[PDB]
Design a protein around this ligand. Structure first.
Ligand SMILES: *[C@@H]1O[C@H](CO)[C@@H](O[C@@H]2O[C@H](CO)[C@@H](O[C@@H]3O[C@H](CO[C@H]4O[C@H](CO)[C@@H](O)[C@H](O[C@H]5O[C@H](CO)[C@@H](O)[C@H](O)[C@@H]5O)[C@@H]4O)[C@@H](O)[C@H](O[C@H]4O[C@H](CO)[C@@H](O)[C@H](O)[C@@H]4O)[C@@H]3O)[C@H](O)[C@H]2NC(C)=O)[C@H](O)[C@H]1NC(C)=O
Ligand code: HEM
Ligand SMILES: *[C@@H]1O[C@H](CO)[C@@H](O[C@@H]2O[C@H](CO)[C@@H](O)[C@H](O)[C@H]2NC(C)=O)[C@H](O)[C@H]1NC(C)=O
Ligand code: NAG
Ligand code: NAG
Ligand code: CA
Ligand code: CA
Ligand code: CA
Ligand code: CA
Ligand code: CA
Length: 595
């Protein structure tokens, strides 16, 4: 006796037959089940939640409550002993540019966001959580182990607030706690346009019927747009430099300014919307502002889909690409398009691809000024370095000419993220994204490593020797077993990322299976998938086949030279060609119509 009932706060829209464009919320995509893939609903559960009390309390909440007869290890102790390293020499990916990392974060932000519970401000709560490190309600602090240097320097804990959950986000109900996905499950450019009607309207220029997105009125980049500023206070981007006082950008996704290169990629995408709207207006002078905005939005969504499925996923999944994501055969309205709770952890493989520095390069691909290269941690919520230090071109040149970090069993997550993370309202460059990922796995009720191995038809190692064989690494398996005591208790984020990479890929078997299944479902379960008959025309699909990140750069910067294959390692000048050489997006098939 089902009860798909619950989903309380409700962006409840009824669905119009033969409606020509996506909703902003993702409602009405699936005709039979219109909430499927819509924002502000529960993450899908591919397996039942696993909580200390079967309902809502994370493993690790109650010190004396074991998981399978063993205490779960402190998130920070796993971080310190397994995830950390000192030496950045030799850690770079010799065949992935920095754009490979950056596109991952972009796609991730299109697909999923499980924000911390509201509780608001004006409350003795997250203040107390930060101050006194007392576990209670939504305060689930990351406690330092006795030997942790941060115990000496930073107090007894890293504050950590539990993720929001659907129906109530205060009291609770008699099924398990289900965390919210606040963005649309569809790969639909929700990170540009918003997943909520109010934000989507606020992002638009509704003054002119030109179908444009709002742009910064305070600063321009050699005549090219910046995103608008978010004028909400306090601003973490003002906080990190109170002399410069440059606010965060406002985008479709709340996280756009988290680091300077995310903000950079957001800037490219916004510019591309306005370039498309202007061109469609020239082609189609009688199209109104709503029509121009929707047609540009639809093209930019197809661009994101094609870059992702054609260029990115093959070099993530390598040999597993054909196993999990066969050639597209059409829309299947029986496929669940919802992002799963586990996927939101599987996609954090990107955290091990983030290198320790960011470079700005000039028109000659040489160092931009006397501090061309900067430590990553100085660039969290850093917008002033864009406006006041050369705009986005030097940063885009670095995305092309510099490399991603290569995942390494001995060098997993750079100290820029593992020790120097900045979080809004928490003042210090002193947080640990790895420990946060582990604590969040437990927050979200994640089944352990072997449950997911089973889910993926893979062996479930029970002993040291079994884990050493799966990981192909004796020392890492010994460190895992000393902390976790059974592979059944290994948190999915660390167990998935501990596996050796598949041939031609950048994730191991378990991740290839969880990522592949999810990407297959968001493609096959999307009625507005670019290649679905009647979404675009035959002639439009032919034009769309020629999109490239290189053309996106040529069209929306003053960069003269780009590589043809932007995700691989490219060196200047050898691998860089003139922009005039790069295929263009031919918009002539968007002519209203012809004869
Ligand atoms: C939404 O979309 C709209 C337009 O589609 C955007 O509105 C336009 O914004 C830009 C600013 O970013 C304005 O450009 C300025 O233009 C002046 C030159 O003014 C002349 O030409 C204008 C463009 O055709 C025209 O609009 C002007 O006409 C208005 O003003 C006169 C009074 O002068 C009035 O008589 C008319 O009736 C109109 O009301 C005029 O003919 C230019 O000098 C400005 O430069 C100064 O400021 C910039 C900083 O932005 C600085 O760099 C310069 O060096 C200099 O100090 C500036 O370029 C344009 O005027 C706006 N159009 C309208 C109709 O208002 C809007 O910005 C979008 N909003 C968002 C949030 O994205
Ligand atoms: C410098 C780069 C990056 C920074 C600073 C960063 C920071 C963060 C932070 C602070 C969180 C929230 C953690 C939590 O509270 O649980 C997060 C979540 C996440 N990150 Fe990263 N990250 C980066 C790069 C990447 C990359 C490259 C990928 C993927 C390829 C990625 C995928 C994700 C995903 C999926 C989440 C969870 C989103 C959700 O809530 O559903 N990130 N990241
Ligand atoms: C905050 O931003 C300001 C710029 O607004 C940075 O100051 C500039 O940086 C160096 C000073 O060593 C010089 O090139 C400029 O003369 C400075 N300008 C001003 C106005 O001071 C400053 O370094 C940033 N500070 C931090 C902590 O990031
Ligand atoms: C780099 O990777 C791409 C696939 O992403 C491939 O075409 C090329 O052979 C690789 N180059 C090297 C040097 O391995
Ligand atoms: C449609 O989806 C269902 C559920 O994934 C699946 O069982 C069925 O085989 C799919 N149809 C295809 C592949 O045509
Ligand atoms: Ca739903
Ligand atoms: Ca989306
Ligand atoms: Ca522009
Ligand atoms: Ca800096
Ligand atoms: Ca090792």
């Amino acid at each position: 006796s089902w009860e798909v009932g619950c989903g309380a706060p409700v962006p409840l829209v009824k669905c119009d037959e033969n409606s020509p464009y996506r909703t902003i919320t993702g409602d009405c995509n699936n005709r039979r089940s219109p909430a499927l893939g819509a924002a502000n609903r529960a993450l899908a559960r591919w397996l039942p939640a696993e909580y200390e009390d079967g309902l809502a309390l994370p493993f690790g909440w109650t010190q004396r409550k074991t998981r399978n007869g063993f205490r779960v290890p402190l998130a920070r102790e796993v971080s310190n002993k397994i995830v950390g390293y000192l030496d950045e020499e030799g850690v770079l990916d010799q065949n992935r540019s920095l754009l490979f990392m950056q596109w991952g974060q972009i796609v991730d932000h299109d697909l999923d966001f499980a924000p911390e519970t509201e509780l608001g401000s004006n409350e003795h709560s997250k203040t107390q959580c930060e101050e006194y490190c007392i576990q209670g309600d939504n305060c689930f602090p990351i406690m330092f182990p006795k030997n942790d240097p941060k115990l000496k320097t930073q107090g007894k804990c890293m504050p950590f607030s539990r993720a929001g959950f659907v129906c109530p986000t205060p009291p609770y109900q008699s099924l398990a706690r289900e965390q919210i996905n606040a963005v649309t499950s569809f790969l639909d450019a929700s990170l540009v346009y918003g997943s909520e009607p109010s934000l989507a309207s606020r992002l638009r220029n509704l003054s002119s019927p030109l179908g444009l997105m709002a742009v910064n009125q305070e600063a321009w980049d050699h005549g090219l747009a910046y995103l608008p500023f978010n004028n909400k206070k306090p601003s973490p981007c003002e906080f990190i430099n109170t002399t410069a006082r440059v606010p965060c950008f406002l985008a479709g996704d709340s996280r756009a300014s988290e680091q300077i290169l995310l903000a950079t990629a957001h800037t490219l995408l916004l510019r591309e919307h306005n370039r498309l709207a202007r061109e469609l207006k020239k082609l189609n002078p009688h199209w109104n502002g709503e029509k121009l905005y929707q047609e540009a939005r639809k093209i930019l969504g197809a661009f994101i889909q094609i870059i992702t499925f054609r260029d990115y996923l093959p070099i993530v999944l390598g040999s597993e690409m054909q196993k999990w994501i066969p050639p597209y055969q059409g829309y299947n309205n029986s496929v669940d398009p919802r992002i799963s709770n586990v996927f939101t952890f599987a996609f954090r493989f990107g955290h091990m691809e983030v290198p320790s520095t960011v470079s700005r390069l000039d028109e000659n691909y040489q160092p931009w000024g006397p501090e061309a290269e900067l430590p990553l941690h100085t660039l969290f919520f850093n917008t002033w370095r864009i406006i006041k230090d050369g705009g986005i071109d030097p940063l885009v040149r670095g995305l092309l000419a510099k490399k991603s970090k290569l995942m390494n069993q001995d060098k997993m997550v750079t100290s820029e993220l593992r020790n120097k993370l900045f979080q809004p309202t928490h003042k210090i460059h002193g947080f640990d994204l790895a420990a946060i990922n582990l604590q969040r796995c437990r927050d979200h009720g994640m089944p352990g490593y072997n449950s997911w191995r089973g889910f993926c038809g893979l062996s479930q190692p029970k002993t040291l020797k079994g884990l050493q064989t799966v990981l192909k690494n004796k020392i890492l398996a010994k460190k895992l077993m000393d902390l976790y005591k059974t592979p059944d208790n290994i948190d999915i984020w660390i167990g998935g990322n501990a596996e050796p990479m598949v041939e031609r890929g950048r994730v191991g078997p378990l991740l290839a299976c969880l990522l592949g299944r999810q990407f297959q479902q968001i493609r096959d379960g999307d009625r507005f998938w670019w290649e679905n008959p009647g979404v675009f025309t035959e002639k439009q699909r032919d034009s769309l086949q020629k999109v490239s990140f290189s053309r996106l750069i040529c069209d929306n910067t003053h960069i003269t030279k780009v590589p043809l294959h932007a995700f691989q390692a490219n060196n200047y000048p050898h691998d860089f060609v003139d922009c005039s050489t790069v295929d263009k997006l031919d918009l002539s098939p968007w002519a209203s119509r012809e004869n």
